[PDB]
């Protein structure tokens, strides 16, 4: 199909000829979307900057303050940082014609948009834990992590080095009382903390760890295609879902190419390519593939077991110094 971008926006984007992206989306997961968008619009050269969530924020703020060349479009899983920027004058207002039935809590008016509904899952190495050994609750994982064999065998986020690690563990702490028991079991099991999914997965795949808690189901699905021993367990007591936020740089040199790429990401075409080929868990329900809301809800035991973090100015509460203090004081003491 063809994203419903205005023909004037397509022509203005052809005159630009170039799109600069700053994204936290691993290029391995983004590549089929970049390739399909280039098929749709062969007259746009894409520069894809695969970067950490905190680095995207710091670099965009710096380059903007210097009056320097920056990104046309920012795409990041660190929801609070994206909502902060889009609510402080960094976002180009644009009403996507592909976002007409987005819920109000999946967009910041016309400033920024949900592009995904991506669960925080458990991944494990089947050579070391069989599917039957891997509990699907915070209470059951706390019990497994009491076992001597699990000491040194757990990976999770470092929320002090990954801004999305903070997004995901902060939401878990806020919504699930059992997260506290689980965090103390991270301490008991001497959990190693990582600033990226890839660094935690590498250790699970080698067997250095048996289990990783809280990383993107999107990355796990795609890694499974080439790594037979990767298992995925979905939490049935409650699953945190992030929504990768996209917004256009207010000072983009190529605003129209950015509009085309945003509309593509939100379109049936982009969302189906996410669900079927990229194996990024799509935001849209009307999709076919393995990485769908329907597949997520079936695995966790209903939509009511998913807490989707909203794309809302309300989530900036998580950046309040007292709220960061409460979470990080509890966290640091539990996991050491």
Binding site listing for Mg(2+) = 24, 26
Separation CA 302–CA 285 (nearest Å): 14
* Smallest distance, Cl ion to C-beta of residue 117, A: 6
CB of 270 to Cl ion, least distance (A): 18
* Residue number with the smallest Cβ distance to Cl ion: 308
- Please, are residues 299 and 131 in contact by the beta-carbon 8 Å criterion? no
Stretch that binds Cl ion, among 26-34, 79-87, 189-197, 212-220 (CB under 5 A): 189-197
Show contacts with Cl ion in window 304-323 (CB under 5 A): 308
Element (DSSP H or E) covering residue 171:
helix 163-175
Total residues in contact with Cl ion, by rule CB under 5 A: 4
Comparing CB distances to Cl ion, the nearer of 194 and 297 is 194
Q: Contact region for Cl ion (CB under 5 A) — 11-19, 216-224, 251-259, 303-311?
A: 303-311
298's enclosing H/E stretch is helix 293-300
Task: Please identify, among the stretches 143-151, 193-201, 244-252, 269-277, the one whose residues bind Cl ion according to the rule CB under 5 A.
Answer: 193-201
Minimum CB separation of residue 275 from Cl ion in Å reads: 16
Taking CB under 5 A as the rule, which mask of x and - marks residues 195-214 in contact with Cl ion?
x---x---------------
Instruction: For 113-144, give the DSSP string.
Output: EE-B-EEEEEEEETTTS-GGGS-SSHHHHHHH
* Number of continuous H segments (helices) and E segments (strands) in the chain: 13, 12
Q: How far is CA 258 from CA 83, 237, 273, in A?
A: 18, 39, 19
Residue 95's CB is within 10 A of a number of other CB atoms, namely 9
> Least distance (Å) from Cl ion to the CB of residue 324?
20
- If phi over 0 gives left and psi between -120 and 50 gives alpha, with beta otherwise, what is residue 279? left
Residue from 75, 94, 194, 297 in contact with Cl ion (CB under 5 A) = 194
Least gap, CB of 245 to Cl ion (angstroms): 14
Question: Which lies closer to Cl ion via its Cβ, residue 261 or residue 297?
Answer: 297
Binding site for Cl ion (CB under 5 A): 194-195, 199, 308
């Amino acid at each position: 199909s063809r994203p419903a971008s205005d023909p004037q926006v397509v022509e203005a984007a052809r005159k630009e000829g170039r799109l600069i992206i700053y994204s936290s989306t691993d290029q391995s997961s983004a590549q089929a979307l970049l390739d399909d968008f280039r098929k749709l619009y062969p007259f746009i050269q894409i520069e894809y900057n695969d970067l950490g969530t905190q680095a995207i924020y710091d670099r965009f703020v710096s380059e903007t303050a210097a009056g320097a060349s920056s990104a046309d479009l920012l795409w990041s899983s660190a929801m609070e940082l994206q909502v902060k920027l889009a609510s402080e004058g960094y976002a180009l207002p644009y009403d996507s014609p592909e976002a007409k039935n987005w819920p109000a809590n999946a967009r910041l008016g016309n400033l920024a948009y949900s592009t995904t509904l991506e669960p925080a899952v458990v991944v494990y190495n089947k050579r070391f834990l069989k599917p039957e050994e891997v509990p699907t609750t915070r209470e059951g994982l706390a019990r497994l992590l009491q076992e001597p064999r699990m000491r040194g065998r757990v990976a999770t986020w470092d929320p002090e080095r990954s801004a999305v690690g903070f997004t995901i563990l902060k939401a878990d702490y806020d919504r699930f009382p059992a997260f506290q028991e689980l965090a103390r079991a991270f301490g008991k099991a001497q959990a190693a903390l990582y600033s990226s999914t890839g660094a935690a997965f590498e250790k699970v795949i080698s067997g250095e760890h048996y289990l990783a808690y809280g990383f993107f189901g999107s990355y796990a699905l795609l890694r499974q295609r080439t790594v037979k021993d990767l298992g995925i367990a979905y939490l049935t007591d409650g699953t945190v879902a992030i929504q990768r936020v996209a917004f256009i740089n207010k000072r983009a040199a190529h605003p129209n190419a950015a509009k085309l790429f945003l509309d593509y990401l939100l379109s049936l075409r982009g969302q189906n390519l996410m669900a079927y080929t990229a194996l990024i868990f799509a935001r849209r329900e009307t999709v076919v593939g393995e990485a769908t809301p329907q597949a997520l809800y079936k695995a966790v035991g209903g939509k009511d077991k998913v807490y989707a973090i909203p794309v809302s100015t309300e989530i900036l509460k998580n950046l309040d110094p007292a709220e960061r203090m409460r979470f990080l004081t509890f966290w640091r003491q539990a996991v050491r």
